[PDB]
């Protein structure tokens, strides 16, 4: 199976970091980048599935980045996130290969469960249960 890889483009690292051992821990290979550029390190670095553009101010709207990962790899996916879907580029972005919109309003949980249901390599914690 996919060894379950992702990539964390945000600039508010804590947030970064937050979903990067949140998906890590499922076991998502997650990598931290704070900008596109660092985005397509990662990408060639890892080649993450999920890459989680944060569209907000990390460098450049998560779009062009996942443009180009999806150049260097349309294999991959986004999961940009918005003020709460700004429209436009909202839509282009999950029109690209983004799965999902997260914003500011998130569960946490719904983000991980949300990576593990579009590629699910263990996920969770214990097993495969009913509870989350």
Not at 95 to 117: S, Y
Request: aromatic fraction near 6%.
């Amino acid at each position: 199976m996919m060894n379950e890889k992702i990539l964390i483009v945000d600039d508010q690292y804590g947030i970064r970091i937050l979903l990067n051992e949140v998906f890590n821990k499922e076991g998502y290979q997650t990598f931290q980048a704070a900008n596109g550029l660092q985005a397509l390190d990662i990408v060639t670095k890892e080649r993450p599935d999920l890459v989680l553009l944060d569209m907000k101010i990390p460098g450049m709207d998560g779009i062009e980045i996942l443009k180009r990962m999806k150049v260097i790899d349309e294999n991959i996916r986004v999961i940009i996130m918005t003020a709460y879907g700004e429209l436009d580029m909202i839509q282009e972005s999950k029109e690209l290969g983004a799965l999902t919109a997260f914003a500011k309003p998130f569960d946490i949980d719904e983000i991980r469960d949300a990576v593990k249901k579009y590629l699910p390599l263990k996920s969770n914690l214990e097993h495969h249960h009913h509870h989350h």
